[PDB]
Write a structure and sequence with these properties.
The structure is cut from a larger assembly and holds chains A (193 residues), B (596 residues), C (213 residues) and D (227 residues).
Chain A lengths: L14 E5 L17 E4 L15 E8 L29 E6 L14 E3 L11 E2 L5 E2 L13 E2 L2 E3 L13 E8 L17
Antiparallel strand pairs in A: 1-3, 2-4, 3-10, 4-10, 5-9, 7-8
Chain B lengths: L2 H31 L5 H23 L10 H10 L9 H17 L20 H5 L6 H11 L3 H4 L1 H16 L6 H6 L17 H30 L10 E2 L30 H4 L6 H13 L31 E5 L2 E4 L8 H16 L17 H13 L2 H6 L15 H7 L7 H14 L11 H5 L7 E2 L24 H16 L19 H8 L10 H4 L12 H6 L1 H8 L19
Parallel strand pairs in B: 1-4
Antiparallel strand pairs in B: 2-3
Chain C lengths: L15 E7 L11 E6 L6 E5 L13 E5 L2 E7 L8 E8 L4 E4 L3 E2 L11 E5 L11 E2 L1 E7 L5 E5 L15 E2 L5 E5 L2 E2 L1 H4 L5 E7 L2 E7 L3
Antiparallel strand pairs in C: 1-5, 2-3, 2-6, 4-5, 6-7, 6-8, 9-11, 10-15, 11-14, 12-16, 13-14, 16-17
Classes of the chains: A mainly beta (193), B mainly alpha (596), C mainly beta (213), D mainly beta (227).
The structure holds 2-acetamido-2-deoxy-beta-D-glucopyranose (4 copies) and zinc ion.
EC number (chain B): 3.4.17.23, 3.4.17.-
Protein name (chain B): Angiotensin-converting enzyme 2
Membrane topology (chain B): Single-pass type I membrane protein
């Protein structure tokens, strides 16, 4: 239901899922032959099922086609520093694919939002839902669309008739946790013949 | 501070104009496809809201100062956003030029001049008057078609064109300029960089400097066609005066390719053609875009995205819906690129299939750039980089290696000169027309010539610059120069002199590193991946770098020169000097056919 | 739905009363903050504490909120005369794609003494009989508290049709009053001999009868 | 600031409801506005939240495409439209305000709420009410105090008030609430206590005011002669 649902969330308030008291198999997520890009840092993509971890943190949101290269540790920009920062010790595993026939429609689908302005930087793994008007000048505006005051939250431009580098890409990241706790969720031993 | 406050103001326009230009271009896409009564309401609603958003952001940007930021990428775009135009005047003068612009676009569209013998059988202008003037072999037919065309429409358009010049001079006077001619010269001006400044006093200096060497080439080909028109019309054309006004091929005298079939110097050798090779293959429009896409990837240019093949006009599905043909590009944004082509199995459709395709390749350069990094100070860069690949596809060497042209056709000393004179009717023939049309408008906007001397000064420069003669003298009540496509819709004309000098500087800079030390008319860019890297490096610049800094690393010159123009027609320059032994070169200003 | 709450909790006026909120590992245990609200029966709910770390303006400091892993807790000190409301859990759920509230707990011990009731039976008038209906009313007043079981009889069988009981409201002298209707028709109203409404209150059964003829 | 909403409103099972949300002052065109409902019997649900600046809708997956919420920037008001009503729509809606913040949680909180709109729907729609007088008998009065009043039947909708002598009687009045019926209707009562010496000199007249139906029935009360 995280992958296939009726609709998704935005980047300023994304879906947070915790996998506990479960068991899974990462072999069906590799032989799907339906994902566009697949990056998996910190661990090899084919030898992550044998090693066991404690918790799995999965976040799901939408992003454009030209910003899929920004989900990586060690760069600056507009989305990766104001919505979701990536730390240096990031052992996550990002999976992205194109589903332009469901999250977009004719006439202009503007249901998903994003944050453009921010006062300063933010700590990684932190959500920002502040809808306050970012003041640019030195005078207060008291919530008006006048001078030296602009709204940080802006709308998308998703259209299903676009090209390849600007389509709504369903991107998910699977991060692992390492603490003083036994193994909880982990791929077990494959049933051989 | 000012650095972080200006960043939030620029990107808000980058994320808002990308949606305003997307819906306005969407209203123009359905307007050209299925002509209804409701699609024109979407264009007027999105057209008025786009003009209202430009005049609202211009009044807000006037409060911000200018002389405190040292960055170059913000200063060049702040002058583009502070372009009020029609909003500098009051509410009475702002609507007055909108009505005369809609009146100018309606009368020039349905141009209907027809017979005095009967008021019923009448023909339209486009494509009505373009086909009869192209296929014509009589002298009395073209003389009547030129006199009647400026007979009925020349009376009504003059009192409206005399009013169109006062509103354009008053708009530039309130825009902190002298006249309307400085508004066109101010677009080519740069600011911020040192040692590469371009003022307006030097724009008239270099244009007059290059005209003193092209005119010797122009007066040599003017005597060549004068030596060819004497044998066809011995009682109408004399080799002493000038060429008539109705014998310029077309009506306006822009393209001189209509006289190519009647000025053949060697009729015993067959010319190259693609129509005879496309009937045995059933060459469709999908094969046109496929073989042209294979030519662009083999040189270093990237591919085209999948969004181009989804929404693109390929052919007209019968006669159920009406679709007008005009080749133009539409920058929708966010990786959306459309085209409008009504393909036919002809000879001229193959040249425009690769020309307009180069516009899309230039539109895909700034794909990762916002709305404020569009084309630079001149709009001639789109036509320059789009026609250099069409000339590389029209050579017999490219058609032979692709598997279409027959290898038995040799290149002797009789079929290679015909290819040089064919391209001179569209490129060299418009160079003297550009100096005459622009300098007449650059002096009428100031006001040193009265209203009773606009026509007399117009006919005086047409005998010394371009060298044409008139069969009937016209008084000041006629309006001749307001029948062009660019003057009727307030378009620019400096771009035509730049696209003619940049199309040959790019033809020599792409095969100079491809170990092609041969002639310039045999240059080709096939199988050269290193030449495509240095070319694509400056297509993604846009308005961040001036034009004088982009061509420094390409051709090695700060200003434009005609040295590639003098070297491309070097076999043509040796062919014009050995044939003119008995014909007089030049023209006379006191010659007239009505004085005999 | 995904958030459950106890139906009722007991406490004493002067000790510490704690409440517990349990959900899933995707709405409260994932990392989202919890918000507690107070639903007073008769006014709009307001904000009490957000994030379990800050204090809004206008709220006393006696409320304490904490998050112990996957469950949130609310602890109060001292029961005043305004805690007769309901406490809810609000937390952002990702499976529901929005905010979802909890069940709600009622905070009341016991405050209703007893008393002696007094009933009044009124037969329908003459103008009501031609309207093709019969409304047998049975008014009860001056009793405490407002928990009366109303039953009807016709001297031969109990009436289990058309019986209605209204909720009692507080009077001006700290008493309660209610009424019970019986929807009948005048065709059978004259055939039976008598009618009565029998009620009980802590065993006290008062019976009053009328006669149409 | 304060948010003021409309009062009680009733409709038909299958019609559309049109309520509003008014704002007193400012700080309405800068923060998100959501709608929180509450029904007696279950918990509190959340339909959706609307941003007034960009005009973007954000509903939940539990509610289908049957309710639309719009906003206005000229007068700073919000409207609610909901058609095809069902039998479980008898609840109250609230016009709430959201104030986001920063932190690891970052949950949507409701710091400012509205007044409330009681939107109930059922059968037995508005018709003409019928009031019946009530008179004491010789057996019902044993001392110097008699009980009498007026009974209101087949009235709709709420709220309906009952006045005694145009408000001239204050001591001894008691207004009984309504009750749901099997047909979806209500019934109330109003009795007074007067001494027996004033039954033959001063009269008691009940006046019912039903402002949604605009019916004012003025009936006479007389003691019975047979008992
Ligand atoms: C164009 O408009 C006409 C108007 O009747 C309509 O019938 C037709 O379907 C439209 N075509 C497209 C492709 O929308
Ligand atoms: C001015 O700022 C822009 C963007 O902030 C930057 O690209 C440019 O290099 C700056 N100018 C100078 C001279 O550093
Ligand atoms: C575009 O060209 C590149 C390079 O040859 C190739 O890898 C890619 O598959 C092509 N794409 C399409 C849609 O033809
Ligand atoms: C490049 O050379 C190869 C081999 O001769 C040829 O097949 C191909 O057509 C050439 N490319 C172009 C664009 O002509
Ligand atoms: Zn073009």
């Amino acid at each position: 239901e995280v992958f296939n649902a009726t609709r998704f969330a935005s980047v300023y308030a994304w879906n947070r899922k915790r996998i506990s008291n479960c068991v899974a198999d990462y072999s069906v997520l590799y032989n799907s032959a339906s994902f566009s890009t697949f990056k998996c840092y910190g661990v090899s993509p084919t030898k992550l099922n044998d090693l066991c971890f404690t918790n799995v943190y999965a976040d799901s949101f939408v992003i454009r086609g030209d910003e899929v290269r920004q989900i990586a540790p060690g760069q600056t920009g507009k989305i990766a520093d104001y919505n979701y920062k990536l730390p240096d010790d990031f052992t996550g595993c990002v999976i992205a694919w194109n589903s332009n026939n469901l999250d977009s429609k004719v006439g202009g689908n503007y249901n998903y939002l994003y944050r453009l302005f921010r006062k300063s930087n933010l700590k990684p793994f932190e959500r920002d839902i502040s809808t306050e008007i970012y003041q640019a000048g030195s005078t207060p505006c008291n919530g008006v669309e006048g001078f030296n005051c602009y709204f940080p939250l802006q709308s998308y431009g998703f259209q299903p008739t676009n090209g390849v580098g600007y389509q709504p890409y369903r991107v998910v990241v699977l991060s692992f946790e390492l603490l003083h706790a036994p193994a909880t969720v982990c791929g077990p031993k494959k049933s051989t013949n | 501070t000012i650095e972080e406050q200006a960043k939030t103001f620029l990107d808000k326009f980058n994320h808002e104009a990308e949606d305003l230009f997307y819906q306005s271009s969407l209203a123009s896409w359905n307007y050209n496809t299925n002509i209804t009564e409701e699609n024109v309401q979407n264009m007027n609603n999105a057209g008025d809201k786009w003009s209202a958003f430009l005049k609202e952001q211009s009044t807000l940007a006037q409060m911000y100062p200018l002389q405190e930021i040292q960055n170059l990428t913000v200063k060049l775009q702040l002058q583009a956003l502070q372009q009020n135009g029609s909003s500098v005047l009051s509410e009475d003068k702002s609507k007055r030029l909108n009505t005369i612009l809609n009146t100018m676009s309606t009368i020039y569209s349905t141009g209907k001049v027809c017979n005095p013998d009967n008021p019923q059988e009448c023909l339209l202008l486009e494509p009505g008057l373009n086909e009869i003037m192209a296929n014509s072999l009589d002298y009395n037919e073209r003389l009547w078609a030129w006199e009647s065309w400026r007979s009925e429409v020349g009376k009504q358009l003059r009192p409206l064109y005399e009013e169109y010049v006062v509103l354009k001079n008053e708009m530039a006077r309130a825009n902190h300029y002298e006249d309307y001619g400085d508004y066109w010269r101010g677009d080519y001006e740069v600011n911020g960089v040192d040692g590469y400044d371009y003022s307006r006093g030097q724009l008239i200096e270099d244009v007059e400097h290059t005209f003193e060497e092209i005119k010797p080439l122009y007066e040599h080909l003017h005597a060549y066609v004068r030596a060819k028109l004497m044998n066809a019309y011995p009682s109408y054309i004399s080799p002493i005066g000038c060429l008539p006004a109705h014998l310029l091929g077309d009506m306006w005298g822009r393209f001189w390719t209509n006289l190519y079939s009647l000025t053949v110097p060697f009729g015993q050798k067959p010319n190259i053609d693609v129509t005879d090779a496309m009937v045995d293959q059933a060459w469709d429009a999908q094969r046109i875009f496929k073989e042209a896409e294979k030519f662009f990837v083999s040189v270093g240019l990237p591919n085209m995205t999948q969004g181009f093949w989804e929404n693109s006009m390929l052919t007209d599905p019968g006669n159920v819906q009406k679709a007008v043909c005009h080749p133009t590009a539409w920058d929708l944004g966010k990786g959306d690129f459309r085209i409008l082509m009504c393909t036919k199995v002809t000879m001229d459709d193959f040249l425009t299939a690769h020309h307009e395709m180069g516009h899309i390749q230039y539109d895909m350069a700034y794909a990762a750039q916002p709305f404020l990094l569009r084309n630079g100070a001149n709009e001639g860069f789109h036509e320059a980089v789009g026609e250099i690949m069409s000339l590389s596809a029209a050579t017999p060497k490219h058609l032979k290696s692709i598997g279409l042209l027959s290898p038995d056709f040799q290149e002797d000393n009789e079929t290679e000169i015909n290819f040089l004179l064919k391209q001179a009717l569209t490129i060299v023939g418009t160079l003297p027309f550009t100096y005459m049309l622009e300098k007449w408008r650059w002096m009428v906007f100031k006001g040193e010539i009265p209203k009773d001397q606009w026509m007399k000064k117009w006919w005086e420069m047409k005998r010394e610059i371009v060298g044409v003669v008139e069969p009937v003298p016209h008084d000041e009540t006629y309006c001749d120069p307001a029948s062009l496509f660019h003057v009727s819709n307030d378009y620019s004309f400096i771009r035509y002199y730049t696209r003619t000098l940049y199309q040959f500087q790019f033809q020599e800079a792409l095969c100079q590193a491809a170990k092609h030390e041969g002639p310039l008319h045999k240059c080709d860019i096939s199988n050269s991946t290193e030449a495509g890297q240095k070319l694509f490096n400056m297509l993604r610049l846009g308005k961040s770098e001036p034009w004088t800094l982009a061509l420094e690393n390409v051709v090695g010159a700060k200003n434009m020169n005609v040295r590639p123009l003098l070297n491309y027609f070097e076999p043509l320059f040796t062919w014009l000097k050995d044939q003119n032994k008995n014909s007089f070169v030049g023209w006379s200003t006191d010659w007239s056919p009505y004085a005999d | 739905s995904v958030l459950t709450q106890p139906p009722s909790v007991s406490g004493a006026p002067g000790q510490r009363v704690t409440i517990s909120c349990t959900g899933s590992s995707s709405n409260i245990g994932a990392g989202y903050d919890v918000h507690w609200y107070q639903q007073l029966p008769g006014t709009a709910p307001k904000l009490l504490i957000y994030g379990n770390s800050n204090r809004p303006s206008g709220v006393p400091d006696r409320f304490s909120g904490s998050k112990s892993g996957t469950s949130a807790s609310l602890a109060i000190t001292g029961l005043q005369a305004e805690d007769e409301a309901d406490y809810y859990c609000q937390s952002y759920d990702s499976s529901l794609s929005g905010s979802v509230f909890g069940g709600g707990t009622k905070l009341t011990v016991l405050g209703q003494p007893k008393a002696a009731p007094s009933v009044t039976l009124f037969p329908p008038s003459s103008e009501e009989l031609q309207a093709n209906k019969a409304t047998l009313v049975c008014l009860i007043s001056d009793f405490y508290p407002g928990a009366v079981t109303v039953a009807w009889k016709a001297d031969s069988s109990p009436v289990k049709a058309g019986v209605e009981t209204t909720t009692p409201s507080k009077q001006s002298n700290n008493k309660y009053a209610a009424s019970s209707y019986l929807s009948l028709t005048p065709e059978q109203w004259k055939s039976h001999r008598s009618y009565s409404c029998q009620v009980t209150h802590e065993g006290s059964t008062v019976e009053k009868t009328v006669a149409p003829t | 600031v304060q948010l003021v909403e409309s009062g009680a409103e009733v409709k038909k099972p299958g019609s559309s409801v049109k309520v509003s949300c008014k704002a007193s002052g400012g700080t309405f065109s800068s923060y998100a506005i959501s709608w929180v409902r509450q029904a007696p019997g279950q918990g509190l649900e959340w339909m959706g939240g609307i941003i007034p600046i960009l005009g973007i809708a954000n509903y939940a997956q539990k509610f289908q495409g049957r309710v639309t919420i719009t906003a206005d920037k000229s007068t700073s008001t919000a409207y609610m439209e909901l058609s095809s009503l069902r039998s479980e729509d008898t609840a109250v809606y609230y016009c709430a305000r959201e104030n986001g913040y920063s932190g690891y949680g970052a949950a949507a909180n409701f710091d400012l709420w509205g007044r409330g709109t009681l939107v109930t729907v059922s059968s037995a729609s508005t018709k003409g009410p019928s009031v019946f007088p009530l008179a004491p008998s010789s057996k019902s009065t044993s001392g110097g105090t008699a009980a009498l009043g007026c009974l209101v039947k087949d009235y709709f909708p709420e709220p309906v008030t009952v006045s005694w002598n145009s408000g001239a009687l204050t001591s001894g009045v008691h207004t009984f609430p309504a009750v749901l019926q099997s047909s979806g209707l209500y019934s109330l009562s109003s009795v007074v206590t007067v001494p027996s010496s004033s039954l033959g000199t001063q009269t008691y007249i009940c006046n019912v005011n039903h402002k949604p139906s605009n019916t004012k029935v003025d009936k006479k009360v007389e003691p019975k002669s047979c008992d």
